[PDB]
Amino acid sequence: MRIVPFGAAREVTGSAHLLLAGGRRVLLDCGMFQGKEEARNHAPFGFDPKEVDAVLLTHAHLDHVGRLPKLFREGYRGPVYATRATVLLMEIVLEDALKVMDEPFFGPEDVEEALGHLRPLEYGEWLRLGALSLAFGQAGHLPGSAFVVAQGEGRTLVYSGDLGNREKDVLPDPSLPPLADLVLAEGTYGDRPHRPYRETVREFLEILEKTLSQGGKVLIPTFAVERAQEILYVLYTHGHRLPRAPIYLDSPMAGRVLSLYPRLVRYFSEEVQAHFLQGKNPFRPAGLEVVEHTEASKALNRAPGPMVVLAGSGMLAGGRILHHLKHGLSDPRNALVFVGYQPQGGLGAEIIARPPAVRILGEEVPLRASVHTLGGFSGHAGQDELLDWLQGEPRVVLVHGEEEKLLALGKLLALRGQEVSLARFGEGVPV
Ligand SMILES: O=c1ccn([C@@H]2O[C@H](COP(=O)(O)O)[C@@H](O)[C@H]2O)c(=O)[nH]1
Ligand SMILES: O=c1ccn([C@@H]2O[C@H](COP(=O)(O)O)[C@@H](O)[C@H]2O)c(=O)[nH]1
Ligand SMILES: O=c1ccn([C@@H]2O[C@H](COP(=O)(O)O)[C@@H](O)[C@H]2O)c(=O)[nH]1
Ligand SMILES: [Zn+2]
Ligand SMILES: [Zn+2]
Numbered sequence: 001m002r003i004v005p006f007g008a009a010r011e012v013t014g015s016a017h018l019l020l021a022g023g024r025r026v027l028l029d030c031g032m033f034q035g036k037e038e039a040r041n042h043a044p045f046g047f048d049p050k051e052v053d054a055v056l057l058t059h060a061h062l063d064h065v066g067r068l069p070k071l072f073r074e075g076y077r078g079p080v081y082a083t084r085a086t087v088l089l090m091e092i093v094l095e096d097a098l099k100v101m102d103e104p105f106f107g108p109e110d111v112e113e114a115l116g117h118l119r120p121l122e123y124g125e126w127l128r129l130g131a132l133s134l135a136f137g138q139a140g141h142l143p144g145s146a147f148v149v150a151q152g153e154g155r156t157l158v159y160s161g162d163l164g165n166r167e168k169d170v171l172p173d174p175s176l177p178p179l180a181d182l183v184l185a186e187g188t189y190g191d192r193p194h195r196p197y198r199e200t201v202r203e204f205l206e207i208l209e210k211t212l213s214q215g216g217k218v219l220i221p222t223f224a225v226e227r228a229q230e231i232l233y234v235l236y237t238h239g240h241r242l243p244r245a246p247i248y249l250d251s252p253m254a255g256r257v258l259s260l261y262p263r264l265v266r267y268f269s270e271e272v273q274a275h276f277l278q279g280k281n282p283f284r285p286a287g288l289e290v291v292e293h294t295e296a297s298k299a300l301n302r303a304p305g306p307m308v309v310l311a312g313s314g315m316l317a318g319g320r321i322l323h324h325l326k327h328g329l330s331d332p333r334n335a336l337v338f339v340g341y342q343p344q345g346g347l348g349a350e351i352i353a354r355p356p357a358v359r360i361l362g363e364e365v366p367l368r369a370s371v372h373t374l375g376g377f378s379g380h381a382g383q384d385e386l387l388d389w390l391q392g393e394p395r396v397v398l399v400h401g402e403e404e405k406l407l408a409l410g411k412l413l414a415l416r417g418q419e420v421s422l423a424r425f426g427e428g429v430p431v
Contacts, residue, residue, distance in 0.1 A: 001155050001431040003184055005423040006046050008399040012188060013037060013063040015400060017159060018047055020428065021152050022130040027055045028148055028159045032066025035343065041067060041105045046426050050075040054129060057082040058161025059145035060089035061225060062097055069094065069110035072117070080114065081121040083136065085144025085267045089225065091115060092256050138175035140164030141379055142226050143267035149178060157431045160185040162400070163381035163389060167197035170230050172269045174381065176389065182431045183393045184423070186380070186400035190409025193382035200376025205238055207335055207372055208308065212243040216333035217305040221321045223314035224254040226379065227340055229261060231310060233272070235285035245306040247287045250297050250320050254310065255290035258283055301327035305334070314340045316347040326360040334369035339377040387412060396420045397429050
């Protein structure tokens with residue numbers, strides 16, 4: 001048994017790993033590259049799609065399923081396994097990616113072909129392929145997210161997929177992995193742990209009361225898939241002590257995801273499920289409003305506070321959020337609250353440097369509004385959690401992370417007596 005990295009080698013996007021064992025070929029994830037690596041979605045996979053026996057998707061995010069339609073576009077016609085939740089979220093993600101994408105590397109017929117071969121596989125359910133046995137484990141990173149357990153030829157491999165941040169409340173705790181001959185694991189935060197969750201919420205709430213009590217606007221850049229709904233959840237469970245104000249989920253996509261959430265109840269933590277049992281949707285805080293079009297979105301820029309605004313892109317790459325910043329950063333009564341990692345050299349970082357001004361949408365805008373970064377809202381396991389999850393595993397191959405972050409984790413794992421390396425693109429690793 002061998003595992004071949006075909007994405008996320010010393011980088012965080014493009015996750016795709018070819019599992020070779022028993023004359024069978026199983027692709028573990030098929031994500032697109034993003035940001036500065038976007039063009040690479042137009043390049044070859046590195047393997048022959050037509051020879052793939054099956055595909056397992058760990059979660060619906062674009063950097064894990066974005067190239068799936070390219071796979072079908074190039075011949076593949078085998079099954080694609082994933083949890084019901086992922087299958088459902090995928091439709092929303094892929095349909096949107098198709099529409100909202102400068103240079104497309106796939107057409108609408110490919111998305112249809114992809115969606116049509118999706119087959120549900122829940123946690124604890126074993127898929128048989130030749131002498132190979134596969135199963136999903138709880139990853140706690142997204143509704144329906146998982147890590148993969150592959151056992152065959154008398155050996156065991158575990159592909160972590162993306163591990164969640166267990167301190168948070170919306171998703172169930174990641175399950176520990178079984179003891180394995182090899183663990184292919186992410187190390188996004190291989191270099192550090194996150195600020196504790198609870199104190200992150202307290203701080204989040206203090207910022208809201210302060211800003212809303214004075215009539216200002218709280219701008220929150222957010223990813224549409226799960227981060228936005230999580231903020232909504234915090235607003236729900238604490239709205240009782242926050243000043244009344246409209247909550248604008250200024251993201252059609254996030255709205256569609258939110259709508260799907262009631263059908264995914266079993267994929268949330270016990271806490272969330274219990275809320276649903278009492279007949280209530282904890283992702284709909286009072287005052288919630290979904291802004292569907294540009295006109296209402298822009299109008300918000302001119303309307304006075306108090307108000308809470310959630311918009312994308314989550315990394316200020318573009319989107320409606322840029323317009324809210326352009327018109328709201330110059331007011332000291334407002335507040336910009338990051339709840340998701342900001343890339344180095346991006347607009348976020350620039351703002352965090354707290355310079356006199358910033359250039360947004362071709363204009364120099366004064367930065368008077370307060371700024372806050374709440375890394376505790378992160379959706380990935382922090383360094384400490386990564387070490388706990390990896391505890392006792394003899395061999396670890398790291399993926400999904402910047403080289404240095406990955407090295408930082410490897411060093412600690414090595415000092416712990418665990419064999420580790422940083423996966424290299426196209427280079428098979430024996431299990
Ligand atoms: O594009 C879609 C959306 C939903 N469903 C199906 O509609 C039913 C209800 O969805 P859900 O309750 O499982 O979320 C399920 O049997 C599901 O497979 C589809 O086949 N295709
Ligand atoms: O040091 C980091 C931390 C996170 N991320 C990326 O940014 C996203 C946001 O992660 P988070 O805000 O949930 O922590 C992740 O999906 C990942 O691709 C990085 O590139 N480097
Ligand atoms: O170190 C390796 C080992 C296998 N493969 C890939 O595995 C498939 C063939 O497997 P096999 O004939 O080595 O068993 C090919 O698509 C090839 O790209 C690699 O890329 N690198
Ligand atoms: Zn992810
Ligand atoms: Zn990822």
